[PDB]
Amino acid sequence: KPLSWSEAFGKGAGRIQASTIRELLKLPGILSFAGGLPAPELFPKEEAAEAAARILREKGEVALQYSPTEGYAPLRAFVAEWIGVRPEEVLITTGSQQALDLVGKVFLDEGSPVLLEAPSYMGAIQAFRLQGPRFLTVPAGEEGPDLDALEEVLKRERPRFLYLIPSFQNPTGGLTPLPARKRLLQMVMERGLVVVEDDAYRELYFGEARLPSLFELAREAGYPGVIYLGSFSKVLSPGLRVAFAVAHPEALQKLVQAKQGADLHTPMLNQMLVHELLKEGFSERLERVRRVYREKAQAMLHALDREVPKEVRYTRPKGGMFVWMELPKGLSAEGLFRRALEENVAFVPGGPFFANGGGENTLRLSYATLDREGIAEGVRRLGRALKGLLALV
Amino acid sequence: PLSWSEAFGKGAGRIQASTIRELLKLTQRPGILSFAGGLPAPELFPKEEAAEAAARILREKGEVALQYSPTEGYAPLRAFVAEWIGVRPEEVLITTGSQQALDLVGKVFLDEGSPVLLEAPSYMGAIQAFRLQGPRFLTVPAGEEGPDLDALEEVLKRERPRFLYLIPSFQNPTGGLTPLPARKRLLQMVMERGLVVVEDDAYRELYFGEARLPSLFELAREAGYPGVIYLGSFSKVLSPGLRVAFAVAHPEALQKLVQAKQGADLHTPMLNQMLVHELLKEGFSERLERVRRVYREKAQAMLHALDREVPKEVRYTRPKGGMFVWMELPKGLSAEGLFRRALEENVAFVPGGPFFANGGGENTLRLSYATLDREGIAEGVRRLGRALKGLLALV
Ligand SMILES: Cc1ncc(COP(=O)(O)O)c(CN[C@@H](CC(C)C)C(=O)O)c1O
Ligand SMILES: Cc1ncc(COP(=O)(O)O)c(CN[C@@H](CC(C)C)C(=O)O)c1O
């Protein structure tokens, strides 16, 4: 009886085939606009080094030992104070990608309806796809989800939850404005629906102020149905894998129960280190994050405006890390990617961001990682690839 | 008015057991001496060397350490694991604890109603991970010499489990040690039927005798059989709180684990992997020898104490490695009830029930001698003896 792997795997093995995540993470003179990797010039290496050594010397017996599933209590407290909730309503997760996996586990079943935008974040699609749901979509544009399309969906289908990224959506960069957020909240409250609000880019706004979150608006309305995800990845360090979920206790409790068997607890040194880094100077750190991303976005748009012919369209984000690019109808972003690689530049083709397919002429560009000169040079290389693609028609 | 209970899916009903989160916050009750969680001896933690190493990593390589990193793990760590275990680097996946490896295995191999084979009892974390997928648990008893192979033969004549989950070396929770001939017989049974084994080797290095037994993975590799997925961890030998472990498998299986890991957490934190690699680059053998000495001495301290304080109606194992003593009360007596009395005497342990996937074992309990110094072991056992005497006096 020779062993067959294909025959020994379960259904889960046939739902995890997309490889965008590992392909974006994989470790020469290629300039990357691919993964949403935060600017390394913002990492506080020296402060981190001091703080990590102090933790390990003075509290190493706690930091290196098994620790609570719910998270380091001072970090839960810091998060609660920042977000505006009780500490017991905060779960520390091993990145918000883990919170998405936990959400999928708690809420989805084979064939269960779930709603997100087309496009939306590939990580969330991948986490949810594991459970074998039926994906329902609405379009995403410059002002967020198409609420008219959503109204029609909700007449016929009750999603297990709605997954949204109101602030600088991955991958479009779209910003759901305040009146739309209120309308959306009304639509959800009228049917007692659950919303998973992913606020990874919360603090990366380019204007004067952050918009109220769906969670904030819900809290004001007395409505308990928003599960709120945030992360320290975009504002401090993605490699530490420290993030959080905030919810009504009944929901949060299920997330904590799921977390036990996922990894026991998020590494304790990491939580301690985030807390030590942010307990002073957080406001100021966030202001500097905004100034850097504003400047890189400006450089990206200047470079694109210079190098990209008008037959190719792209968004002009008001925050976050991404530009979203649309090629002429029927042109292949995958084909372009192969040409870009020969020109020593990378991006993410758009296909993985569309849960039910389509989008093969779209692509996402991240300006977060490179400095302004590498942005300018990377876009010059992209422009050459685009020009090659268009010239073949 | 929103209804949470109606909003959840089936998974919300399969995650109710709270043993894990309960064991992990016992620290919040510092006056209680713990024989509960398998928390490693903190006197072994290399705090100073770790502080120095972490600071050097963040100053010299902080742009790698603090950035998004490969799903498969830090390459020098993969290589280090590959050299230690005896495989190619590309056959290693770094995981956020072996608990995550368990969750990944469940994801890849189990569906609702699918059969899975494990012992009764077995590790509650594995039970918890697998239960999420809604499987049918098949069991065989576990004893001093590991799984009951005659019982296993009967199971395998009737069913093809998606995998067999075993812990051949110092099983959680019994401390059982599967001897070499039983390992070969198990291997033969699985090879003849083309089944998969998940071999959890958390306690690999914690042997009290002269040498480590061959793993089922090593035996399978010698026989040319690709069906063993091998799990190991740095938790019991270096630091559990860092959450760094590994899965080793044939590339076809390993690839599905890597695929699953993407959407679980993107990647295991990179500083943690670097730190583990830096700490183990030199002196690993000597570290391991020290681990063995310490747990050998704590096991001896525990048995000495039990032998003086525990009434002879109560049975307990005498482990040859690992972290645990497995205790069985007279039939019908409640480990849970004993636990409540133990809490009143300021000692904790883990009742046996969570370790039995299909129920049972309500008279059994696990004791961990890993965490306390010898004086705390002696005092905790005096406190446990008082609880036990109170339990037995009520009859
Ligand atoms: C919208 C959104 N939500 C969550 C995540 C996950 O981030 P953490 O787990 O670090 O908190 C993200 C991250 N996005 C990048 C992931 C790559 C694998 C690097 C990306 O390039 O999309 C997110 O955008
Ligand atoms: C047999 C066995 N396999 C895996 C694990 C998980 O450990 P890591 O994820 O740290 O690698 C364990 C650990 N066991 C303890 C867990 C408690 C929550 C602390 C235990 O008390 O059982 C294991 O024993």
Swiss-Prot record, chain A:
Catalytic activity, reaction form: L-2-aminoadipate + 2-oxoglutarate = 2-oxoadipate + L-glutamate
Pathway note: Amino-acid biosynthesis; L-lysine biosynthesis via AAA pathway; L-alpha-aminoadipate from 2-oxoglutarate: step 5/5
Consequence recorded when altering S19E: Strongly decreases the affinity for AAA and Glu. A mild decrease of affinity is observed for 2-oxoglutarate. Increases the affinity for leucine and 2-oxoisocaproate
Residue positions where N6-(pyridoxal phosphate)lysine is found in the record: K259
EC number: 2.6.1.39
Entry binding sites for pyridoxal 5'-phosphate: Y66, S96, Q97, N170, D198, D199, A200, Y201, S231, F232, S233, R241
Primary enzyme class: transferase
Site residues (Recognizes the side-chain carboxyl group of acidic compounds), renumbered to this chain: R22
Positions contributing to substrate binding: G36, N170, R364
GO molecular function, one term: pyridoxal phosphate binding
GO biological-process terms attached to the record: lysine biosynthetic process via aminoadipic acid
Claim: NAD is one of the keywords in the record: no
Cofactors that this protein relies on: pyridoxal 5'-phosphate
SUPFAM superfamilies listed in its UniProt record: PLP-dependent transferases
Pfam families assigned: Aminotran_1_2
Phenotype upon changing R22A: Strongly decreases the affinity for AAA and Glu. A mild decrease of affinity is observed for 2-oxoglutarate which has the same chain length as Glu, but differs by the presence of a 2-oxo group which is not recognized by R-22
Function: Catalyzes the transfer of an amino group between 2-oxoadipate (2-OA) and glutamate (Glu) to yield alpha-aminodipate (AAA). It can also transaminate glutamate, leucine, and aromatic amino acids. It also contributes in the biosynthesis of other amino acids such as leucine.
Protein family (similarity comment): Belongs to the class-I pyridoxal-phosphate-dependent aminotransferase family.
Descriptive protein name: 2-aminoadipate transaminase
Source organism of this protein record: Thermus thermophilus (strain ATCC BAA-163 / DSM 7039 / HB27)
